[PDB]
Amino acid sequence: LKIKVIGVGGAGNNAINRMIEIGIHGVEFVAVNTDLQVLEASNADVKIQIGENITRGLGAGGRPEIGEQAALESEEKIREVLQDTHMVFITAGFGGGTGTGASPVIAKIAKEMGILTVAIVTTPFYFEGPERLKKAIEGLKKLRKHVDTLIKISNNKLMEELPRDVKIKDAFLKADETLHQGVKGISELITKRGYIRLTSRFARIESVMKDAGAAILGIGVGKGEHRAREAAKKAMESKLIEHPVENASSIVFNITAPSNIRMEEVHEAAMIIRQNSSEDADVKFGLIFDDEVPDDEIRVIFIATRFPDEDKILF
Amino acid sequence: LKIKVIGVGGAGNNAINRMIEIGIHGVEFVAVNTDLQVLEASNADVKIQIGENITRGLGAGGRPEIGEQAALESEEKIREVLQDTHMVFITAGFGGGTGTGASPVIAKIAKEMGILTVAIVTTPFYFEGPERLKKAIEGLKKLRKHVDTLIKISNNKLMEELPRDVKIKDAFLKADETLHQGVKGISELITKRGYIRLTSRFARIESVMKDAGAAILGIGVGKGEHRAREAAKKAMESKLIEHPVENASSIVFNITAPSNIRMEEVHEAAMIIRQNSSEDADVKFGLIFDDEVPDDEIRVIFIATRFPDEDKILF
Ligand SMILES: Nc1nc2c(ncn2[C@@H]2O[C@H](COP(=O)(O)CP(=O)(O)OP(=O)(O)O)[C@@H](O)[C@H]2O)c(=O)[nH]1
Ligand SMILES: Nc1nc2c(ncn2[C@@H]2O[C@H](COP(=O)(O)CP(=O)(O)OP(=O)(O)O)[C@@H](O)[C@H]2O)c(=O)[nH]1
Ligand SMILES: [Mg+2]
Ligand SMILES: [Mg+2]
């Protein structure tokens, strides 16, 4: 999986530099601007200067039509950087010429390529004036037509959260942090598998199996639309069971399934547990995602222990 | 984590060889027997001959008291093999002399040593006669005195699942498989992390973000006993949210938490979603176990999309 974060314009460049300093796992950063000095200050993996002939590396002068023309004239350079990319986050502060004007063009180029295109952009603070806000709104109307998902962050709303006497510099740093949180938050759901501390699940198993006494064991596999309920029924309604699980005061139930498992399926398995156990029983549910398990299959294992009359199970 | 599977007696030896052939991830295998010939046919990591002076390499002739004395005579070897061990599975077929008599001694030693001691043994088939079942029953009574969890499997139940004209050898293979399933099943909950295909998580996010339009994004972190509902509230009740999440027809909700998260915590988080969303909204849950997240923390991120009037959000 190839995921790129593209900062467009001054604000966008400033924002990704913060993301780079803090860190976002598994993504590549790209800085895009008509302002050469700002690009040179970028720590992104790749820097793309656009509209060199119309701006001469001096920025778009606050004109969105110039930022739009800059991106169009540099279409190939942009396309080139988007090759072999599965997803892209386009971030910028709308209100000026480059972020506002170039972002919709970059979005169109990416979506045209079938790339999952997500935009996370801001609208200007109130103190910035009406012209800035107007430019941002017109920019959003164009951006909207060329992205898969559009997350708009109102800087005015951020102002409401910030302290009464916050300095402008700090208000913008807050904006940077908000964009960062959004990009990192979504992207890491895809790039970070998550670490599993095996000693942690041994602790959960130990707490239930230590001095537990006689126990009922059940295993079941399921396949298809109702794989969960089917695996659950096979395990809890197993023939090996000589005494009703209904008498157990403790029940450990674990589901091992591919990442595509839905919460609804977990619920269906839970309804089976309830129909085969005491309402007063302490039920501990375990979940393990294992894509080594066939796409339409599921595995269930449960242990029922701590019965009132243990002799009913052993003999 | 050091886990050992100990097969005691003929049935136990035969059962673990099957486990060894099929395979059980991350566990060590130990074969124990008075019967030297059978022991030499084992593919276990360690082979322990017990009662060399009492039975001289032969079996115990169906006498549990002999199996017991054999284990006691070879107690030093048993304690040696149980060193550097966190958990043990003691498996055998009760009814004969070695498995029935030696298993409780080994369990006693392991438990005294602080090892999580799980026993998974079988009671004989009806066709084997009353005497054998009687011996197994007395064995179970001794075993129960010193074990953490005692899982008893009734071969008579297995019979009610196989052909009417089954060959003895196949009845026993059926029993080996059942023992294998139990040991592998519980063991791998602790030794196998589970594989995560990242392209699969991308599919879940793509399905909700592709051509979704304007979206609302919320992020929250929680800590302590009610970390789940608190992180959910912070995300679902952000001041940046300009349009009620209730108007969204689609909602993706992901929880990233340590492996110690309880299913009850997912419920409290779920109740918050439902109280801030529409009953007709297609809600999708995501769960990622990441023990890099502090043991008492949790992270929540949600994206609400596909509204009827996006203008309300964008402008
Ligand atoms: N997250 C941030 N937003 C910022 C920052 N500075 C400004 N802004 C916001 O973005 C808006 C201006 O963004 P830029 O400076 O990127 C304008 P851009 O460079 O794209 O236009 P041109 O200079 O005309 O080329 C401004 O109206 C603010 O609402 C910053 O450091 N971080
Ligand atoms: N899972 C299996 N169970 C078996 C097998 N053979 C027998 N059995 C079951 O286990 C019981 C006997 O187990 P063993 O053959 O291990 C008797 P053991 O060797 O422990 O006693 P001695 O020979 O007196 O030393 C018997 O009553 C059956 O119910 C086998 O190959 N696999
Ligand atoms: Mg600029
Ligand atoms: Mg024997």
XYZ file of C-alpha atoms and ligand atoms in Angstrom:
696
model
C 0.000 0.000 0.000
C 1.276 3.419 -1.032
C -0.196 6.433 0.782
C 0.951 9.988 0.144
C 0.295 13.192 2.061
C 0.369 16.269 -0.170
C 0.685 19.754 1.330
C -0.420 22.455 -1.128
C 0.519 26.100 -0.643
C 2.005 27.832 2.400
C -0.340 26.527 5.107
C -0.258 23.047 3.601
C 3.540 23.084 3.505
C 3.695 24.333 7.116
C 1.219 21.675 8.206
C 3.019 18.696 6.693
C 6.318 19.905 8.135
C 4.685 19.490 11.544
C 3.407 16.016 10.596
C 6.955 15.125 9.527
C 8.439 16.394 12.790
C 5.917 14.460 14.903
C 5.735 11.493 12.556
C 3.103 9.489 10.681
C 3.793 5.813 10.036
C 3.942 4.414 6.515
C 3.241 7.512 4.422
C 5.298 9.568 1.995
C 5.111 13.370 2.128
C 4.925 15.709 -0.871
C 5.158 19.507 -0.787
C 3.525 21.495 -3.620
C 3.768 25.277 -4.036
C 4.281 28.209 -6.400
C 6.516 29.730 -3.688
C 10.098 28.450 -4.089
C 11.404 29.758 -0.757
C 8.762 27.858 1.193
C 9.381 24.651 -0.771
C 13.096 24.917 0.037
C 12.100 25.032 3.701
C 10.174 21.779 3.296
C 11.257 18.493 4.877
C 8.976 16.488 2.585
C 10.311 13.485 0.688
C 9.437 15.121 -2.640
C 9.048 18.804 -3.539
C 7.104 19.964 -6.583
C 7.296 23.546 -7.799
C 4.336 24.473 -9.988
C 3.516 27.479 -12.167
C 7.144 28.554 -12.528
C 6.444 30.513 -15.713
C 3.387 32.381 -14.412
C 4.628 33.120 -10.874
C 8.404 32.814 -11.195
C 8.477 31.056 -7.829
C 6.934 34.064 -6.094
C 3.579 32.589 -5.081
C 0.167 33.156 -6.675
C -0.435 36.620 -5.212
C -3.578 35.427 -3.442
C -5.322 34.644 -6.748
C -6.964 31.185 -6.959
C -7.174 31.315 -10.754
C -3.385 31.582 -10.786
C -2.975 28.606 -8.461
C -5.342 26.658 -10.708
C -3.398 27.530 -13.858
C -0.118 26.650 -12.121
C -1.378 23.140 -11.331
C -2.749 22.668 -14.849
C 0.504 23.751 -16.499
C 2.316 21.308 -14.192
C -0.136 18.416 -14.673
C 2.498 15.908 -15.828
C 4.786 16.638 -12.875
C 1.814 16.043 -10.547
C 0.674 12.861 -12.340
C 4.249 11.551 -12.138
C 4.291 11.898 -8.350
C 0.932 10.112 -8.057
C 2.001 6.993 -9.974
C 1.564 3.695 -8.115
C -0.301 5.485 -5.300
C -3.375 3.897 -3.688
C -4.472 6.776 -1.473
C -3.715 10.463 -1.110
C -4.456 13.079 1.523
C -4.516 16.601 0.099
C -4.143 19.257 2.772
C -4.165 23.040 2.588
C -5.477 26.230 4.093
C -8.035 27.687 1.684
C -8.180 31.448 1.212
C -5.076 32.250 -0.830
C -4.147 31.486 -4.424
C -2.156 28.241 -4.373
C -3.849 26.033 -1.805
C -7.293 27.208 -2.923
C -6.667 27.040 -6.660
C -4.254 24.132 -7.064
C -5.847 21.617 -4.675
C -8.948 20.914 -6.790
C -6.711 20.270 -9.806
C -4.451 17.865 -7.918
C -7.579 16.133 -6.601
C -8.992 15.732 -10.109
C -5.717 14.271 -11.396
C -5.639 11.736 -8.552
C -9.290 10.708 -8.747
C -8.943 10.395 -12.528
C -6.288 7.792 -11.733
C -8.653 5.860 -9.464
C -6.767 6.958 -6.346
C -8.747 7.151 -3.090
C -8.679 10.939 -2.741
C -9.193 12.501 0.679
C -8.988 16.234 1.272
C -8.616 17.820 4.699
C -8.590 21.593 4.325
C -9.405 24.647 6.435
C -11.466 27.797 5.888
C -9.962 31.124 7.149
C -10.451 32.700 10.574
C -12.971 35.539 10.827
C -10.304 38.190 11.415
C -8.828 37.378 8.005
C -11.563 39.228 6.161
C -14.371 38.557 3.644
C -12.230 38.243 0.511
C -10.312 35.340 2.027
C -13.499 33.574 3.113
C -15.127 34.111 -0.282
C -12.120 32.645 -2.087
C -12.223 29.627 0.234
C -15.923 28.973 -0.410
C -15.478 29.125 -4.193
C -12.495 26.828 -3.786
C -14.564 24.297 -1.825
C -17.189 24.231 -4.581
C -14.535 23.074 -7.052
C -12.747 20.716 -4.653
C -16.038 18.989 -3.867
C -16.434 17.795 -7.463
C -13.072 16.016 -7.487
C -12.489 14.188 -4.202
C -13.814 10.987 -2.670
C -14.069 12.463 0.829
C -13.860 16.126 1.815
C -13.137 17.001 5.448
C -13.474 20.750 6.000
C -12.053 22.234 9.182
C -13.448 25.620 10.194
C -10.715 27.708 11.774
C -13.426 29.838 13.378
C -14.555 26.773 15.322
C -10.952 26.238 16.447
C -10.891 29.822 17.668
C -13.852 29.058 19.922
C -11.861 26.278 21.623
C -8.659 28.291 22.042
C -7.978 30.659 24.970
C -9.441 34.169 24.859
C -6.052 35.849 24.315
C -4.359 33.355 21.976
C -1.687 34.842 19.680
C -2.189 34.437 15.925
C 0.984 32.348 15.653
C -0.415 29.885 18.201
C -3.814 29.812 16.502
C -2.127 28.645 13.305
C -0.030 26.092 15.199
C -3.307 24.695 16.542
C -4.596 24.498 12.967
C -1.419 22.590 12.014
C -1.955 20.141 14.882
C -5.595 19.570 13.927
C -4.699 18.714 10.329
C -1.928 16.470 11.662
C -4.293 14.574 13.965
C -6.701 14.024 11.097
C -4.137 12.747 8.591
C -2.266 10.584 11.101
C -5.495 9.253 12.575
C -6.968 7.959 9.329
C -3.732 6.863 7.642
C -2.456 4.779 10.547
C -5.637 2.677 10.578
C -4.166 1.375 7.314
C -0.406 1.504 7.891
C -0.108 0.363 11.516
C -1.061 -3.255 12.177
C -0.799 -2.798 15.926
C 1.550 -4.619 18.301
C 0.315 -7.694 20.187
C 1.888 -8.347 23.589
C 1.413 -12.100 23.924
C 2.086 -11.963 27.661
C -1.074 -9.858 27.861
C -3.391 -12.545 26.541
C -1.657 -15.198 28.646
C -2.664 -13.074 31.640
C -6.298 -13.144 30.530
C -6.179 -16.904 30.025
C -4.374 -17.433 33.334
C -6.927 -15.417 35.329
C -9.678 -17.734 34.087
C -7.874 -21.088 34.135
C -6.045 -20.812 37.464
C -7.630 -23.038 40.130
C -10.685 -23.256 37.863
C -11.386 -26.945 38.457
C -13.430 -29.079 36.051
C -14.079 -27.423 32.692
C -16.108 -27.900 29.521
C -14.268 -27.291 26.240
C -15.909 -26.505 22.924
C -14.552 -25.755 19.468
C -16.338 -24.804 16.278
C -15.674 -23.614 12.749
C -18.092 -21.718 10.536
C -18.378 -20.630 6.923
C -20.602 -18.254 4.971
C -22.927 -15.378 5.865
C -23.750 -16.808 9.308
C -20.319 -18.287 9.984
C -20.205 -16.711 13.454
C -23.484 -18.098 14.782
C -22.750 -21.441 13.151
C -19.288 -21.742 14.714
C -20.761 -20.687 18.065
C -23.532 -23.305 17.938
C -21.093 -26.051 16.957
C -18.868 -25.251 19.925
C -21.474 -24.685 22.654
C -23.981 -27.289 21.487
C -21.244 -29.907 21.001
C -22.016 -33.578 21.706
C -18.922 -34.027 23.889
C -20.675 -31.805 26.430
C -22.013 -34.102 29.157
C -23.271 -31.368 31.475
C -25.074 -28.124 30.574
C -22.806 -25.101 30.190
C -25.742 -23.302 31.825
C -24.320 -24.265 35.217
C -20.931 -22.645 34.671
C -20.300 -19.365 36.479
C -17.374 -18.475 34.218
C -17.132 -18.586 30.420
C -14.221 -17.710 28.126
C -15.273 -17.349 24.484
C -12.754 -16.463 21.761
C -13.312 -15.663 18.102
C -10.451 -15.883 15.623
C -11.377 -14.444 12.242
C -10.183 -12.499 9.190
C -10.101 -8.703 9.349
C -13.332 -8.496 7.352
C -15.438 -9.660 10.317
C -18.335 -7.318 11.112
C -19.512 -6.230 14.558
C -22.906 -7.716 13.624
C -21.301 -11.152 13.441
C -19.829 -10.735 16.918
C -23.318 -9.851 18.104
C -24.773 -12.986 16.528
C -22.203 -15.139 18.310
C -23.118 -13.345 21.556
C -26.787 -14.258 21.172
C -25.779 -17.918 21.043
C -23.641 -17.569 24.156
C -26.616 -16.082 26.012
C -28.912 -18.933 24.956
C -26.399 -21.484 26.264
C -25.212 -20.009 29.551
C -26.478 -18.642 32.857
C -27.495 -14.988 32.959
C -25.341 -14.734 36.089
C -22.265 -16.193 34.383
C -19.134 -14.065 34.004
C -18.467 -14.026 30.253
C -15.068 -12.990 28.901
C -15.036 -12.415 25.138
C -11.803 -12.745 23.185
C -11.140 -11.478 19.671
C -8.182 -12.246 17.403
C -7.850 -11.003 13.830
C -6.012 -13.518 11.671
C -6.174 -13.157 7.911
C -4.611 -16.593 7.624
C -8.136 -17.800 8.367
C -10.047 -18.226 5.076
C -11.957 -15.088 3.994
C -15.402 -16.558 4.671
C -14.518 -18.639 7.716
C -14.305 -18.213 11.463
C -13.048 -20.195 14.449
C -14.533 -20.305 17.923
C -13.218 -21.852 21.114
C -14.803 -21.580 24.524
C -14.103 -22.800 28.021
C -16.776 -23.033 30.704
C -15.557 -23.465 34.285
C -16.389 -22.987 37.956
C -19.544 -25.059 38.332
C -21.541 -25.457 41.572
C -21.528 -29.260 41.416
C -18.244 -30.254 39.788
C -19.010 -33.959 40.261
C -21.743 -33.695 37.615
C -19.096 -33.024 34.961
C -16.290 -35.371 35.969
C -18.593 -38.276 36.778
C 6.170 -17.580 27.118
C 7.222 -21.197 27.588
C 4.473 -23.758 26.955
C 4.915 -27.526 27.165
C 2.624 -30.321 25.996
C 3.211 -33.527 27.952
C 1.831 -36.792 26.590
C 1.675 -39.449 29.301
C 1.373 -43.156 28.538
C 0.620 -44.822 25.205
C -2.447 -42.795 24.235
C -0.715 -39.608 25.312
C 2.391 -40.519 23.338
C 0.306 -41.358 20.270
C -1.704 -38.144 20.594
C 1.266 -35.782 20.764
C 2.941 -37.435 17.779
C -0.148 -36.439 15.797
C 0.085 -32.916 17.236
C 3.748 -32.865 16.208
C 3.009 -34.048 12.660
C 0.141 -31.597 12.129
C 1.854 -28.869 14.115
C 1.108 -26.537 17.013
C 2.829 -23.163 16.998
C 5.187 -22.135 19.779
C 4.986 -25.138 22.124
C 7.522 -27.732 23.308
C 6.616 -31.443 23.334
C 7.478 -33.986 26.046
C 6.758 -37.740 25.892
C 6.521 -39.683 29.171
C 6.107 -43.441 29.505
C 7.132 -46.582 31.366
C 6.982 -48.307 27.950
C 10.425 -47.757 26.395
C 9.516 -49.129 22.959
C 6.642 -46.679 22.534
C 8.773 -43.847 23.913
C 11.455 -44.500 21.280
C 8.848 -44.023 18.540
C 8.123 -40.486 19.756
C 8.985 -37.340 17.811
C 8.796 -35.164 20.932
C 11.525 -32.698 21.886
C 12.103 -34.545 25.156
C 11.483 -38.208 25.995
C 11.273 -39.164 29.666
C 11.342 -42.822 30.671
C 9.837 -43.215 34.134
C 9.959 -46.159 36.510
C 13.031 -47.716 34.916
C 13.574 -49.750 38.081
C 9.923 -50.615 38.724
C 8.812 -51.697 35.211
C 12.223 -52.105 33.557
C 11.205 -50.599 30.224
C 7.834 -52.313 29.964
C 4.384 -50.829 30.549
C 2.666 -50.836 33.951
C 0.324 -53.653 32.962
C -2.777 -51.541 33.484
C -1.949 -50.802 37.138
C -2.393 -47.117 38.031
C -0.514 -47.645 41.306
C 2.501 -48.720 39.240
C 2.237 -45.689 36.981
C 2.084 -43.540 40.101
C 5.140 -45.145 41.711
C 7.028 -44.826 38.411
C 6.395 -41.081 38.272
C 7.475 -40.699 41.887
C 10.689 -42.671 41.322
C 11.535 -40.389 38.388
C 10.419 -37.182 40.107
C 13.787 -35.453 39.624
C 13.616 -35.821 35.835
C 10.065 -34.446 35.819
C 10.991 -31.397 37.917
C 13.974 -30.837 35.641
C 11.882 -30.779 32.465
C 9.321 -28.441 34.069
C 11.914 -25.739 34.744
C 11.623 -22.529 32.713
C 7.948 -23.275 31.992
C 4.907 -20.989 32.284
C 2.149 -23.396 31.267
C 1.710 -27.114 30.639
C -0.912 -29.274 28.988
C -0.924 -32.787 30.453
C -2.673 -35.154 28.077
C -3.366 -38.863 28.274
C -5.966 -41.557 27.967
C -7.112 -42.658 31.410
C -7.904 -46.320 31.977
C -4.466 -47.908 31.886
C -1.550 -47.792 34.303
C 0.832 -45.061 33.142
C -1.427 -42.286 31.888
C -3.884 -42.778 34.755
C -1.276 -43.150 37.502
C 1.511 -40.812 36.398
C -0.542 -37.840 35.190
C -1.730 -36.755 38.652
C 1.833 -36.899 40.004
C 3.128 -34.745 37.156
C 0.229 -32.308 37.626
C 0.948 -32.101 41.361
C 4.602 -31.243 40.712
C 3.811 -28.655 38.033
C 1.191 -26.886 40.133
C 3.440 -26.788 43.200
C 6.005 -25.123 40.915
C 3.591 -22.318 40.044
C 2.987 -23.514 36.483
C -0.468 -22.997 34.933
C -1.478 -26.664 34.901
C -4.067 -27.780 32.353
C -5.026 -31.421 31.959
C -6.874 -32.744 28.924
C -7.594 -36.447 29.302
C -10.120 -39.009 28.084
C -12.263 -41.666 29.766
C -12.391 -45.052 27.934
C -14.958 -46.254 25.391
C -17.813 -48.428 26.659
C -16.525 -51.384 24.611
C -13.337 -51.397 26.703
C -15.153 -52.665 29.785
C -16.148 -51.507 33.314
C -12.780 -52.137 34.961
C -11.015 -49.641 32.703
C -13.651 -46.957 33.301
C -13.414 -47.598 37.039
C -9.650 -47.008 36.981
C -10.121 -43.828 34.932
C -12.673 -42.545 37.434
C -10.358 -43.055 40.415
C -7.634 -41.377 38.379
C -9.792 -38.313 37.716
C -10.373 -37.990 41.467
C -6.641 -37.834 42.128
C -6.001 -35.510 39.195
C -8.612 -33.033 40.422
C -6.841 -32.665 43.769
C -3.908 -30.932 42.066
C -4.599 -29.150 38.754
C -5.681 -25.697 37.621
C -8.118 -26.692 34.883
C -9.251 -30.258 34.243
C -10.734 -30.901 30.807
C -12.270 -34.374 30.608
C -13.230 -35.749 27.211
C -15.606 -38.720 27.046
C -14.692 -41.170 24.280
C -18.232 -42.558 24.514
C -19.360 -39.247 23.067
C -16.878 -39.486 20.201
C -18.377 -42.869 19.375
C -21.757 -41.179 18.870
C -20.188 -39.253 15.988
C -18.384 -41.932 13.989
C -19.483 -44.917 11.828
C -21.310 -47.899 13.321
C -18.703 -50.381 12.081
C -15.639 -48.315 12.995
C -12.318 -50.105 13.393
C -10.670 -49.795 16.817
C -7.658 -48.011 15.313
C -9.901 -45.339 13.775
C -11.750 -44.768 17.034
C -8.367 -44.042 18.611
C -7.299 -41.745 15.759
C -10.544 -39.849 16.295
C -9.545 -39.448 19.931
C -6.040 -38.243 18.994
C -7.569 -35.585 16.748
C -9.898 -34.364 19.483
C -6.981 -34.013 21.902
C -4.973 -32.256 19.191
C -7.804 -29.774 18.576
C -8.082 -28.919 22.253
C -4.359 -28.369 22.845
C -3.740 -26.514 19.579
C -6.860 -24.419 20.088
C -6.033 -23.149 23.567
C -2.274 -22.965 22.967
C -2.384 -20.791 19.859
C -4.564 -18.205 21.571
C -1.336 -17.476 23.443
C 1.358 -18.214 20.865
C -0.139 -16.902 17.642
C -0.591 -13.153 17.302
C -2.605 -13.523 14.125
C -1.693 -12.123 10.713
C -3.106 -8.788 9.550
C -3.473 -8.141 5.824
C -3.329 -4.343 5.614
C -4.911 -4.269 2.152
C -7.963 -5.691 3.913
C -8.294 -2.742 6.273
C -7.849 -0.421 3.288
C -10.872 -2.117 1.720
C -13.018 -1.331 4.742
C -12.010 2.331 4.679
C -12.296 2.572 0.894
C -15.858 1.224 0.958
C -16.927 4.073 3.219
C -14.809 6.911 1.809
C -15.066 6.292 -1.952
C -17.335 8.960 -3.484
C -18.600 9.765 0.033
C -18.618 13.551 -0.291
C -18.473 15.989 2.616
C -17.556 14.282 5.871
C -17.452 14.927 9.595
C -14.355 13.728 11.463
C -14.013 13.192 15.195
C -11.073 11.966 17.261
C -10.860 11.206 20.956
C -8.570 9.662 23.542
C -9.665 8.152 26.842
C -7.874 6.993 29.962
C -8.887 5.050 33.047
C -11.875 2.866 33.897
C -14.289 4.594 31.517
C -11.716 5.341 28.817
C -13.988 3.898 26.110
C -17.136 5.959 26.537
C -15.070 9.023 27.408
C -12.968 8.828 24.235
C -16.167 8.202 22.276
C -17.820 11.303 23.753
C -14.806 13.534 23.052
C -14.819 12.473 19.398
C -18.584 12.491 18.883
C -18.919 15.818 20.702
C -16.137 17.891 19.131
C -16.597 21.656 18.814
C -15.413 21.421 15.203
C -18.575 19.506 14.343
C -20.804 22.070 12.620
C -23.543 19.702 11.452
C -25.318 17.026 13.537
C -23.796 13.581 12.978
C -27.398 12.357 13.175
C -27.972 13.316 9.536
C -25.281 10.975 8.238
C -26.362 7.744 6.555
C -22.916 6.190 6.997
C -20.636 6.118 10.031
C -17.253 4.450 10.422
C -16.129 4.045 14.032
C -12.724 2.626 14.964
C -11.259 1.689 18.327
C -7.502 1.240 18.816
C -6.738 -0.232 22.230
C -4.441 -2.505 24.247
C -5.239 -6.228 24.323
C -6.739 -5.886 27.807
C -9.841 -4.133 26.471
C -13.063 -5.779 27.678
C -16.121 -6.348 25.474
C -18.084 -4.282 27.986
C -15.954 -1.282 27.031
C -16.947 -1.719 23.391
C -20.599 -1.626 24.463
C -20.313 1.661 26.351
C -18.593 3.123 23.297
C -21.355 1.734 21.075
C -24.137 3.267 23.169
C -22.578 6.683 22.626
C -22.522 6.211 18.855
C -26.187 5.242 18.712
C -27.133 8.225 20.870
C -25.371 10.563 18.424
C -26.409 8.868 15.180
C -29.436 7.819 13.135
C -31.054 4.402 13.508
C -31.069 4.145 9.711
C -27.367 4.970 9.522
C -25.095 2.180 8.297
C -22.567 1.953 11.136
C -19.312 0.057 10.666
C -17.000 -0.777 13.555
C -13.268 -1.233 13.483
C -11.136 -2.722 16.237
C -7.347 -2.705 16.329
C -5.382 -4.226 19.206
C -2.186 -2.259 19.750
C -0.297 -2.823 22.972
C 1.904 0.169 22.175
C -1.078 2.184 23.390
C -0.668 2.739 27.152
C -2.327 -0.085 29.133
C -4.965 2.296 30.472
C -5.702 4.253 27.307
C -7.815 4.063 24.182
C -8.155 5.933 20.886
C -11.325 6.511 18.909
C -11.774 7.930 15.440
C -14.993 8.221 13.501
C -16.009 9.535 10.115
C -19.640 10.370 9.361
C -20.462 10.753 5.669
C -23.131 10.609 2.983
C -25.465 13.342 4.239
C -28.645 14.444 2.408
C -27.653 18.128 2.381
C -23.856 18.467 2.231
C -24.224 22.232 1.868
C -25.095 22.357 5.569
C -21.596 21.053 6.330
C -19.551 22.759 3.632
C -21.228 26.165 3.958
N -2.499 25.352 9.288
C -2.060 26.570 8.927
N -2.892 27.422 8.279
C -2.322 28.638 7.961
C -1.019 29.051 8.235
N -0.815 30.357 7.753
C -1.946 30.672 7.222
N -2.934 29.687 7.294
C -4.350 29.676 6.779
O -4.305 29.417 5.369
C -4.626 30.624 4.618
C -3.509 31.025 3.676
O -2.811 29.889 3.287
P -1.463 30.020 2.519
O -0.522 30.919 3.194
O -1.081 28.603 2.301
C -2.028 30.753 0.990
P -1.184 30.042 -0.435
O 0.202 29.904 -0.081
O -1.822 28.750 -0.753
O -1.517 31.209 -1.538
P -0.487 32.188 -2.307
O 0.505 32.807 -1.481
O -1.270 33.164 -3.059
O 0.310 31.372 -3.311
C -4.892 31.745 5.593
O -6.010 32.495 5.081
C -5.102 31.005 6.917
O -6.478 30.744 7.168
C -0.124 28.126 8.930
O 1.050 28.292 9.256
N -0.740 26.908 9.234
N -6.160 -40.941 21.857
C -5.868 -42.249 22.005
N -6.421 -42.944 23.021
C -6.042 -44.271 23.075
C -5.176 -44.938 22.211
N -5.045 -46.289 22.602
C -5.800 -46.377 23.652
N -6.447 -45.191 24.016
C -7.370 -44.874 25.157
O -6.556 -44.676 26.319
C -6.696 -45.806 27.231
C -5.360 -46.492 27.494
O -4.282 -45.606 27.329
P -2.817 -46.173 27.119
O -2.755 -47.164 26.046
O -1.992 -44.947 27.010
C -2.596 -46.982 28.708
P -1.031 -46.589 29.487
O -0.031 -46.699 28.466
O -1.119 -45.229 30.055
O -0.990 -47.763 30.653
P 0.016 -49.050 30.741
O 0.161 -49.792 29.528
O -0.404 -49.902 31.863
O 1.413 -48.546 31.060
C -7.668 -46.801 26.617
O -8.526 -47.303 27.669
C -8.357 -45.982 25.527
O -9.562 -45.394 26.007
C -4.577 -44.180 21.111
O -3.785 -44.568 20.242
N -4.991 -42.838 21.099
Mg 2.043 31.350 -0.353
Mg 1.148 -48.555 27.724
